[PDB]
Amino acid sequence: MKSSHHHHHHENLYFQSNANIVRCPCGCNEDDGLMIRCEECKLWQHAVCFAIISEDDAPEQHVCNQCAKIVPRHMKPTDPYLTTLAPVVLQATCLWRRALLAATEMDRILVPNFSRRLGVEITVAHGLINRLEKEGYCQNAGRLVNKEKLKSEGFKKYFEK
Ligand code: NI
Ligand SMILES: [Zn+2]
Ligand SMILES: [Zn+2]
């Protein structure tokens, strides 16, 4: 068959519609890893963009960043931090989170491969990789990924609540 996101509200149901797009503050509109569907707008986001890196840590009611300013109070935004960020900062922060999770699947990072992996321009990928280097999550030079430091210190610094 074909692989793409969809929803089973009960175990004997299947719903898919091209109207339920990916719409996430990272600006990437493709499925990639763990995806989560917003309770309010029924559109899809990358869990990692909302600092969710384990399907057991994901909320049962996900409220995306667009919806955070319009749902009643009892529906908490999944990542309140994002609501405080300026738009260009917001996109850069979610992309950084995607980059951190993506780097954990690579032994070495090469700029064209990395740009394609994340769907970004080369100059953006250079910016990300130079940041990974300063943090110590990859080496200076491709660039060997320091997987242990990334998964331990890096996830603590950027994802742990
Ligand atoms: Ni399914
Ligand atoms: Zn995203
Ligand atoms: Zn929403």
Numbering used by the authors: 333 to 473, 479 to 498
Publication text:
To determine these proteins’ structures and mechanisms of chromatin binding, we expressed and purified the Hop1 CBRs of two diverged aquatic Holozoa: Schistosoma mansoni (blood fluke) and P. miniata (star fish). We crystallized and determined high-resolution x-ray crystal structures of both proteins using single-wavelength anomalous diffraction (SAD) methods with the anomalous diffraction of endogenously bound Zn2+ ions. The structures show CBRs with PHD and wHTH domain tightly packed on one another in an overall configuration similar to that of the budding yeast Hop1 CBR, but lacking the HTH-C extension seen in that protein. The S. mansoni and P. miniata Hop1 CBRs are 43% identical at the amino acid level, and are nearly identical in structure, with an overall Cɑ root mean squared displacement (r.m.s.d.) of 1.4 Å over 136 residues. In contrast to the budding yeast Hop1 CBR, we find that S. mansoni and P. miniata Hop1 CBRs bind DNA via their wHTH domains through a canonical DNA binding interface. Mutation of arginine residues in each protein’s predicted DNA binding surface (R389 and R407 for S. mansoni; R463, R477, and R463 for P. miniata) to alanine resulted in a complete loss of DNA binding. We found that the P. miniata Hop1 CBR binds nucleosomes with an affinity in the low micromolar range and that alanine mutants in the PHD aromatic cage (position I residue W376) and the wHTH domain DNA binding surface (R480) each show reduced nucleosome binding. WT P. miniata Hop1 CBR bound to unmodified and H3K4me3 nucleosomes with roughly equivalent affinity, indicating the Hop1 CBR alone does not strongly discriminate between H3K4 methylation states in vitro. We also performed EMSAs with the isolated Widom 601 DNA, and observed that the wHTH domain mutant R480A, but not the PHD mutant W376A, reduced DNA binding. Overall, these data are consistent with bipartite recognition of nucleosomes by the P. miniata Hop1 CBR, with both the PHD and wHTH domain contributing to the interaction.
In meiosis, ploidy reduction is driven by a complex series of DNA breakage and recombination events between homologous chromosomes, orchestrated by meiotic HORMA domain proteins (HORMADs). Meiotic HORMADs possess a central chromatin binding region (CBR) whose architecture varies across eukaryotic groups. Here, we determine high-resolution crystal structures of the meiotic HORMAD CBR from two diverged aquatic Holozoa, Schistosoma mansoni and Patiria miniata, which reveal tightly associated plant homeodomain (PHD) and winged helix-turn-helix (wHTH) domains. Our data reveal how meiotic HORMADs with PHD–wHTH CBRs can bind chromatin and potentially discriminate between chromatin states to drive meiotic recombination to specific chromosomal regions.
